[PDB]
Amino acid sequence: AKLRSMGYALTGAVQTLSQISDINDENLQQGIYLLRDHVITLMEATLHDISVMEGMFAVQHLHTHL
Amino acid sequence: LSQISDINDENLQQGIYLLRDHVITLMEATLHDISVMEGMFAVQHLHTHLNHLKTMLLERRIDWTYMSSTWLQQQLQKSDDEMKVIKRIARSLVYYVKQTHSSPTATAWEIGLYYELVIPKHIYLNNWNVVNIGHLVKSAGQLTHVTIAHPYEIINKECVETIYLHLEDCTRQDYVICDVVKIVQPCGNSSDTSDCPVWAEAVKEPFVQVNPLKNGSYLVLASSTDCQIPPYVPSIVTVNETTSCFGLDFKRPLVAEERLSFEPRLPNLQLRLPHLVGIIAKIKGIKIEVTSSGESIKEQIERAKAELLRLDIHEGDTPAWIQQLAAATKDVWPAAASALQGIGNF
Amino acid sequence: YYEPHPEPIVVKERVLGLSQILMINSENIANNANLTQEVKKLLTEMVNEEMQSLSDVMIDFEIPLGDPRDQEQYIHRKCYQEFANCYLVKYKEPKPWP
Amino acid sequence: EMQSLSDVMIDFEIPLGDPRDQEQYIHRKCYQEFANCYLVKYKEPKPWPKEGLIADQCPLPGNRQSIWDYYIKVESIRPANWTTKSKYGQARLGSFYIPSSLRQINVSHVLFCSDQLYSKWYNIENTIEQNERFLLNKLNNLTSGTSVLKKRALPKDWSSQGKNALFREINVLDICSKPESVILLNTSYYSFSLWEGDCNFTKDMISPYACRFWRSKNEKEETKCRDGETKRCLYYPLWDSPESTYDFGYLAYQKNFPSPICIEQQKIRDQDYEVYSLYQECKIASKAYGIDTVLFSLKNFLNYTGTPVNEMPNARAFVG
Ligand SMILES: *[C@@H]1O[C@H](CO)[C@@H](O[C@@H]2O[C@H](CO)[C@@H](O[C@@H]3O[C@H](CO[C@H]4O[C@H](CO[C@H]5O[C@H](CO)[C@@H](O)[C@H](O)[C@@H]5O)[C@@H](O)[C@H](O[C@H]5O[C@H](CO)[C@@H](O)[C@H](O)[C@@H]5O[C@H]5O[C@H](CO)[C@@H](O)[C@H](O)[C@@H]5O)[C@@H]4O)[C@@H](O)[C@H](O[C@H]4O[C@H](CO)[C@@H](O)[C@H](O)[C@@H]4O)[C@@H]3O)[C@H](O)[C@H]2NC(C)=O)[C@H](O)[C@H]1NC(C)=O
Ligand SMILES: *[C@@H]1O[C@H](CO)[C@@H](O[C@@H]2O[C@H](CO)[C@@H](O[C@@H]3O[C@H](CO[C@H]4O[C@H](CO)[C@@H](O)[C@H](O)[C@@H]4O)[C@@H](O)[C@H](O[C@H]4O[C@H](CO)[C@@H](O)[C@H](O)[C@@H]4O[C@@H]4O[C@H](CO)[C@@H](O)[C@H](O)[C@H]4NC(C)=O)[C@@H]3O)[C@H](O)[C@H]2NC(C)=O)[C@H](O)[C@H]1NC(C)=O
Ligand SMILES: *[C@@H]1O[C@H](CO)[C@@H](O[C@@H]2O[C@H](CO)[C@@H](O[C@@H]3O[C@H](CO[C@H]4O[C@H](CO)[C@@H](O)[C@H](O[C@H]5O[C@H](CO)[C@@H](O)[C@H](O)[C@@H]5O)[C@@H]4O)[C@@H](O)[C@H](O[C@H]4O[C@H](CO)[C@@H](O)[C@H](O)[C@@H]4O)[C@@H]3O)[C@H](O)[C@H]2NC(C)=O)[C@H](O)[C@H]1NC(C)=O
Ligand SMILES: *[C@@H]1O[C@H](CO)[C@@H](O[C@@H]2O[C@H](CO)[C@@H](O[C@@H]3O[C@H](CO[C@H]4O[C@H](CO)[C@@H](O)[C@H](O)[C@@H]4O)[C@@H](O)[C@H](O)[C@@H]3O)[C@H](O)[C@H]2NC(C)=O)[C@H](O)[C@H]1NC(C)=O
Ligand SMILES: *[C@@H]1O[C@H](CO)[C@@H](O[C@@H]2O[C@H](CO)[C@@H](O[C@@H]3O[C@H](CO)[C@@H](O)[C@H](O)[C@@H]3O)[C@H](O)[C@H]2NC(C)=O)[C@H](O)[C@H]1NC(C)=O
Ligand SMILES: *[C@@H]1O[C@H](CO)[C@@H](O[C@@H]2O[C@H](CO)[C@@H](O)[C@H](O)[C@H]2NC(C)=O)[C@H](O)[C@H]1NC(C)=O
Ligand SMILES: *[C@@H]1O[C@H](CO)[C@@H](O)[C@H](O)[C@H]1NC(C)=O
Ligand SMILES: *[C@@H]1O[C@H](CO)[C@@H](O)[C@H](O)[C@H]1NC(C)=O
Ligand SMILES: *[C@@H]1O[C@H](CO)[C@@H](O)[C@H](O)[C@H]1NC(C)=O
């Protein structure tokens, strides 16, 4: 047994945009439009505060975040 | 029950079964990580754990930190994915909290936690809501909206087969949970299909309905034609170029990329209605059952006949009555309807 | 017509009921972490703060199971948490360091 | 934390394309795994020559220093007939001993993964994201299609045509913090000695510490026992012990008093090193064979020795 849901991929079609700015386009319609590319994010880069902390202080800060 | 393993017994029934003996747990034994930390680093790690626990309990959730997964799975006998679902939906109750010792340097406390674990019988992932659009009918002068009472609320389609679900006694704990789920057949006029009741209702003319669908098409049901669209029968409409129809702008959709579909495909169905259905819906003033999907000609007719016969000719509204007779006779004997219309206007 | 229903649907079979008792004791924690008498105060404050806050919003419910005081596991674990490493030695007869 | 989250959530299909095909996913994944990882090739295989290292610029125990791993202590108690020759070969007791593992004859390449050798363009005061862009541009500007760095990138010590465009030069105190890096990568051994005898420097030839040699030579090496020529016997060392002073050659290197310092060079390796970037190789090879394969292939190369270089402490992550 191995579960996986098609709840967001049920219809067999998808409308996609190259740019978030495109969503404002007047001649669109009410509906769901997906930005075409995935956003890719490292946590090391995102959390600056832990970068300048040291030892167990760094560790406990991250724990509070996670 | 003497063991958790006993919950799986086939000759049980749907109910609540308590494990007979209390699970006893020391936090010092559970939290290994603090045991190797020293000074205020230890203290602050515990503070984070305690504050988290409190947060879970306020939301009636269970913090699984204080119970062995392997032990639970080995008692329950369930797959990895079933355990995910079980652990998502389970709920907690605090029935007591008690300080047992208090010194300026030392404390002790006790907590009584009650848990209710739902055990799944089946889990359904690829689901559709029903929407009932019906049809319009014009009968002896009256516009009528007609609908079938379907015996299911959900359609499911995991792989190839499509299943029609009736639900009872449901709640939401993240997911939908139901006590009772009966599989049913769609409607039809045959032994193998459901004999569902048909409802009619009188409606005001002109009738226009236009629903913008999310994929960019429009769902139309209208008493009148525009942009070539047939009246009375509903349809899903799409245009290649923006135009005005029914007083509003049908846009061209954005191009979409294709994917594997899970859309249901219901059986078709032919439905016969009484000749005077518009009159029957009218004199009730309410949405009324007129037929069943399967029903014989004879049973369908003997339904409103005595009622309809007792709408007899009266001294007070003869012209009005004659005009209704002409509307009723038009389709049957046109040559009699024109005559009755002339006498009526006289 | 139809629209998606993204959320899963679970059919119930049965419910299992459980009772768990959690026991907390700051001295056990303070021994392992080599805490000083000053930090033992901080630990004791911090634990009472969290426990008292929970206590202040929750009423008491009767649960239809037997009393924990009658159950072995309760007895064994309570005696342990308190007395595990406590011992009494008797001299043959009373003789001090000279 | 991650496991707890994993345990309550099932998988859902989302109708977009595979991340593995997307450049941002490829570029960021190669970075997170191989940003600072480089392979150096010797012109031909030539080890560090001596087992004994004279390096008085480092302070002695009595902060911690990495070179104290290789420090030989002087012990007052020894067995009967004990000699340094029997244990440390030709090292001077109270200095440093370089193991045979660091001196392998056949080692042709040095693989390292650390940021500590970058030239001034790199600053830890600047932001992670900026330092990323700066490196990413430099590795594009210093490479043409392959993963080989242009000679310009190297320091002058490793190549004639080196202009430090990526890497700084190794200095005299780098041995104390980063021993292995020097022993593997230095082209020449330079001594720094305050030991009476070296460069023929006699105690008369000097034309609180002042003008003095740190360690003077004694008459010989000897031991004496008392009917117990086994376990515990008094040892008389061939040189003095620095325990009492411990700062002398450090404080001398920083010039706080004048002293008779001795420095001699000894060539080891030709100044014609070649350098490859594993980050650039990951990007490039993933365009042909896809990232899943390249990532697994290059991860195994970081474990060529049986210990993965990327899990080592930053300063000590150098392997032949
Ligand atoms: C916005 O969203 C909406 C949806 O919410 C979109 O509308 C939907 O768009 C779909 C297209 O992507 C439409 O599907 C298409 O339907 C066509 C019509 O299907 C009917 O006619 C078929 C042909 O019938 C004639 O010919 C046969 C002999 O070949 C004779 O026997 C008949 O008597 C006729 O003469 C027929 O096959 C279909 O029958 C199936 O459906 C009905 C119910 O509708 C059932 O009663 C049947 O049992 C049958 O379903 C079963 O069997 C079929 C295989 O036979 C299986 O596929 C089913 O799963 C099920 O088991 C209908 O009577 C199709 O012709 C058209 O076919 C294309 O695709 C197939 C492959 O799938 C190719 O092989 C074909 O060559 C062709 O390319 C396609 O299926 C939906 O109808 C429509 N939905 C609704 C409710 O309107 C809307 O467009 C979206 N808009 C935007 C902007 O995105
Ligand atoms: C790993 O590899 C790195 C190189 O990347 C290496 O770092 C270099 O190490 C050497 C050796 O210490 C450093 O050179 C020495 O610098 C001394 C300080 O320089 C100042 O003074 C000179 C002029 O005196 C100025 O030009 C300069 O600008 C500075 O202001 C300098 O005193 C040394 O010079 C003496 O030693 C050399 C040895 O070859 C000799 O040629 C010189 O003429 C000079 O005289 C000698 O003095 C010593 C005692 O001081 C005496 O013993 C000897 O008898 C004299 N000999 C003669 C002929 O008079 C020398 O230039 C170099 O700067 C470092 N470079 C970097 C980048 O830091 C590491 O040491 C290597 N590590 C290991 C362990 O191998
Ligand atoms: C659900 O499905 C049923 C079954 O199809 C629908 O009811 C049927 O509707 C059709 C179409 O209107 C009717 O067809 C007509 O049948 C007569 C002959 O009927 C006699 O012979 C039948 C032989 O099988 C028999 O079943 C009939 O029995 C019923 O009626 C008797 C008498 O009242 C009753 O006692 C029984 O209990 C049954 O109820 C009966 O003995 C035929 O003469 C008609 O001919 C006209 O049409 C044809 C074709 O156009 C044409 O060629 C001729 O010239 C003539 O114009 C016509 O074929 C059928 O009688 C109905 N059967 C039943 C059981 O009602 C039902 O209405 C559907 N429900 C819904 C809600 O849609
Ligand atoms: C109303 O229904 C119409 C069906 O009668 C829809 O028309 C179809 O629309 C698709 C859109 O993808 C067209 O596909 C395009 O085809 C051209 C080249 O044509 C050749 O290739 C296609 C299949 O690729 C084949 O079907 C044709 O016969 C040709 O051999 C490509 O250049 C495009 O990229 C695209 O693939 C169909 O060809 C077209 N079929 C028909 C029968 O018209 C119409 O879009 C619907 N319109 C509205 C208002 O909803
Ligand atoms: C609380 O304080 C005690 C006492 O200092 C700590 O225990 C001590 O921990 C060290 C490191 O683990 C032990 O030293 C090592 O012992 C082994 C076995 O002899 C030896 O191989 C090593 O060379 C080293 O000497 C030390 O023996 C041990 N002392 C005692 C009395 O157990 C403890 O870790 C502290 N813990 C916390 C979480 O506060
Ligand atoms: C790095 O290489 C070493 C040596 O080949 C690998 O160590 C072996 O791993 C297997 C797999 O479980 C063990 O059964 C062997 O006993 C190990 N042998 C030795 C000599 O260690 C190691 O798995 C590799 N590690 C990584 C992170 O790549
Ligand atoms: C080193 O290489 C030589 C020449 O190929 C060979 O004889 C020797 O066995 C190798 N030894 C080691 C330790 O690799
Ligand atoms: C004196 O210095 C020279 C330098 O080349 C060396 O060859 C010689 O061995 C030294 N002699 C003594 C007695 O130290
Ligand atoms: C891999 O093998 C396939 C054929 O199996 C070939 O088309 C392809 O060019 C080869 N090389 C790469 C980089 O995929």
Q: Which of B84, B253, B262 sits opposite A29 (nearest CB)?
A: B253
Q: Quote the tokens at residue B29.
A: 């034994």
Nearest CA to ligand 3 atom 16: B297
Q: Give the residue carrying structure tokens 């008093």.
A: D257
Q: Which structural technique was applied? A: cryo-EM
**Rounded Cα distance, C38 and C16, in Å:** 45
- Kindly determine whether residue B88 and residue D15, on different chains, have CB atoms separated by under 8 Å: no
CB D286 within 8 A of CB D49: no
CB A17 within 8 A of CB B137: no
- Kindly determine whether residue B50 and residue C27, on different chains, have CB atoms separated by under 8 Å: no
- Kindly determine whether residue C4 and residue A11, on different chains, have CB atoms separated by under 8 Å: yes
The amino acid that residue D254 corresponds to is: Q
| Ligand 2 neighbours by CB, cut-off 6 Å | D 157, 169-172, 175, 182, 186, 189-190, 192, 199, 261-263, 265
Spatial CB neighbours of B115, under 8 Å, sequence gap ≥ 6: B62, B90, B91, B92, B93, C17, C18, C19, C20
Q: Using alpha carbons, list the distances in angstroms from residue C40 to B110, B154, B180.
A: 19, 59, 55
Q: Is D289 in the pocket of ligand 9 (CB under 6 A)?
A: yes
- Residue B266 main-chain phi, psi, to 5 deg: -65, 150
**Rounded Cα distance, D239 and B1, in Å:** 81
Nearest CA to ligand 6 atom 4: D306
Considering only alpha carbons, which residue of chain B is nearest residue D12?
B125
**Residues within 8 A of D (CB atoms), A 3-22 only:** 3-9, 14, 16
Name the 3-class secondary structure at A43: helix
Spatial CB neighbours of B245, under 8 Å, sequence gap ≥ 6: B226, B227, B229
- Residue D222 main-chain phi, psi, to 5 deg: -150, 165
CB D43 within 8 A of CB D109: no
- Kindly determine whether residue C5 and residue A7, on different chains, have CB atoms separated by under 8 Å: yes
Q: What is the DSSP letter of D171?
A: -
Distance B196 CA to ligand 3 centre (A): 20
Distance D106 CA to ligand 7 centre (A): 6
Q: Using alpha carbons, list the distances in angstroms from residue D21 to A40, B146, D24.
A: 13, 52, 9
Q: Is B211 in the pocket of ligand 1 (CB under 6 A)?
A: no
Distance B296 CA to ligand 3 centre (A): 8
Name the 3-class secondary structure at C11: strand
Chains touching B by CB (3 or more pairs below 8 Å): A, C, D
**Rounded Cα distance, B21 and D203, in Å:** 88
Q: Which of D4, D10, D15 sits opposite B81 (nearest CB)?
A: D10
CB B109 within 8 A of CB B97: yes
First to last CA, chain C: 100
Residue D261 CA: which ligand 2 atom is closest? 49
What are all long-range contacts of B159-164, with beta carbons under 8 Å and residues at least 24 apart?
B162/B264, B162/B265
Q: Using alpha carbons, list the distances in angstroms from residue B229 to B137, B223, B232, B313, C41.
A: 16, 11, 10, 41, 81
- Kindly determine whether residue C4 and residue A5, on different chains, have CB atoms separated by under 8 Å: no
Q: Is D10 on the interface with B (CB under 8 A)?
A: yes
CB B27 within 8 A of CB C21: no
Q: Is C7 on the interface with B (CB under 8 A)?
A: yes
Spatial CB neighbours of D194, under 8 Å, sequence gap ≥ 6: D56, D213, D214, D215, D248, D249, D252, D259, D260, D261, D262
Considering only alpha carbons, which residue of chain B is nearest residue C17?
B18
Q: Is C2 on the interface with A (CB under 8 A)?
A: no
Instruction: For residue B67, give how far its alpha carbon lies from the nearest alpha carbon of chain C (Å).
Output: 9
- Kindly determine whether residue B88 and residue D9, on different chains, have CB atoms separated by under 8 Å: yes
CB B5 within 8 A of CB C7: no
CB D116 within 8 A of CB D133: no
Ligand closest to the CA atom of residue B242: 4
To probe the interface with D, which of B56, B87, B175 has the most D CB atoms within 10 Å?
B87
Instruction: For residue A46, give how far its alpha carbon lies from the nearest alpha carbon of chain B (Å).
Output: 22
